[PDB]
Ligand binder design. Structure first.
Ligand SMILES: NC(=O)N1CCN(c2ccc(F)cc2)CC1
Length: 119
């Protein structure tokens, strides 16, 4: 019932994500010189270094907020891909499945801890 445990669990999950070769296109803010029309399609860019930095700054109040930003990395990739078979989009699909598999217990434990706190 540890209400704060999610933070270190998210730090460790981000470490696993950075070790994954599939995260390489998503580790840093997108390259506007390589994709000059990116901001025409994507309103809110997001990347894993920004998520990690926001976590480390103490600027997430809950793992649900972190999860919303990570899911935005994947929906941006889906919105920008010219094809559902593209290399970078295929990497985002695998990485999304890995992330969802690991974040589920983090969210469940946090929500359970908050319910216990307010019992
Ligand atoms: N690191 C970068 O400069 N990019 C910007 C474009 N983005 C993307 C997503 C799907 C796709 F199929 C093609 C490109 C991923 C991250």
């Amino acid at each position: 019932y540890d209400i704060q445990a999610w933070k270190k669990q998210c730090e460790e999950l981000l470490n696993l994500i950075f070790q994954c070769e599939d995260s390489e296109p998503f580790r840093q803010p997108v390259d506007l010189l390589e994709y000059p029309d990116y901001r025409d399609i994507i309103d809110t860019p997001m990347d894993f270094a920004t998520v990690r930095e926001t976590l480390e700054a103490g600027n997430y109040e809950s793992p649900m907020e972190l999860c919303k930003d990570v899911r935005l990395i994947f929906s941006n990739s889906k919105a920008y891909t010219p094809s559902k078979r593209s290399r970078i989009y295929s990497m985002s699909l695998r990485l999304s499945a890995f992330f969802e598999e690991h974040i589920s217990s983090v969210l469940s434990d946090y929500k359970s801890a908050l319910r216990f706190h307010k019992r």
